Amino acid sequence: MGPGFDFAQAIMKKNTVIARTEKGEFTMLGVYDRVAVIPTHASVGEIIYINDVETRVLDACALRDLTDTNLEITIVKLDRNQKFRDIRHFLPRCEDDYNDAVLSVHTSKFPNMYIPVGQVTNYGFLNLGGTPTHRILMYNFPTRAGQCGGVVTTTGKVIGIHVGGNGAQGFAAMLLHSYFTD
C-alpha cells in the first residue's frame, strides 16, 4: 500500500524460502550465496526441507553474544543449487530503535502476509521461552504462532527476524551486518 510494504515485498519475493524442520514450518531469510537465517528454536539438523525439497545442511551455527548469551539466530549454509540475491548492504551495522516497521511472513499457513507493526524498541534482554536472550527488538502487535522467522524491515533496512510474542507484544532478534562478513 506504500513504500514500507514495497520494500518488504521486494525482500519476500527474492530473499525468502519456506523452511521445514521437525519443529515446524518457518519463514527463512536468504542473506547471500547459500547462507540463510532462521530462529534457533527451529532446531536445524543435518537435513532441512526448503520449499518442500530435501536439502543437506552444510553448516549451522546458533549465535551467542560474547557474554555467551543466546541471540536466537541460527545461520545456515544450504546445499542448494542457486544463490540468494546479496542483501547484506540492507543490514544495520549497530543496535538501534526504528520507526514504521513491517513484519512479513510467507508459509503454507500464512502466504503473502504483511503486518504494519509501527515503532520498534531496542528492548535488549528478554526471557524468551525460559531462555535469557539479548539484542531483542519489540513491537506492540499481537503476533501469533506461525509468524516465527518473519522478516522485520523498514524502508531500505532488514532489521530482524520474529522469534516470539506474549499476546500483546512481538519480539524479533536483531540482524547486524557483522554476523555475515566473509
Curated annotation (Swiss-Prot):
Superkingdom, taxonomy of origin: Viruses
Catalyses which reaction(s): Selective cleavage of Gln-|-Gly bond in the poliovirus polyprotein. In other picornavirus reactions Glu may be substituted for Gln, and Ser or Thr for Gly
Signal peptide: none
Subcellular location: Host cytoplasm
Domain Peptidase C3: 2-180
Active site: residue positions: H41 (for protease 3c activity), E72 (for protease 3c activity), C148 (for protease 3c activity)
Subunit (UniProt): Interacts with host IFIH1/MDA5; this interaction inhibits host IFIH1.
Function (record text): Major viral protease that mediates proteolytic processing of the polyprotein. Cleaves host EIF5B, contributing to host translation shutoff. Also cleaves host PABPC1, contributing to host translation shutoff. Binds and inhibits host IFIH1/MDA5, thereby inhibiting the type-I IFN production and the establishment of the antiviral state. Cleaves host MAP3K7/TAK1, resulting in inhibition of TRAF6-triggered NF-kappa-B induction. Cleaves host TICAM1; this interaction allows the virus to disrupt host TLR3 signaling. Cleaves host IRF7, resulting in inhibition of type-I IFN production.
UniProt name for this protein: Protease 3C
Species of the source: Human enterovirus D68
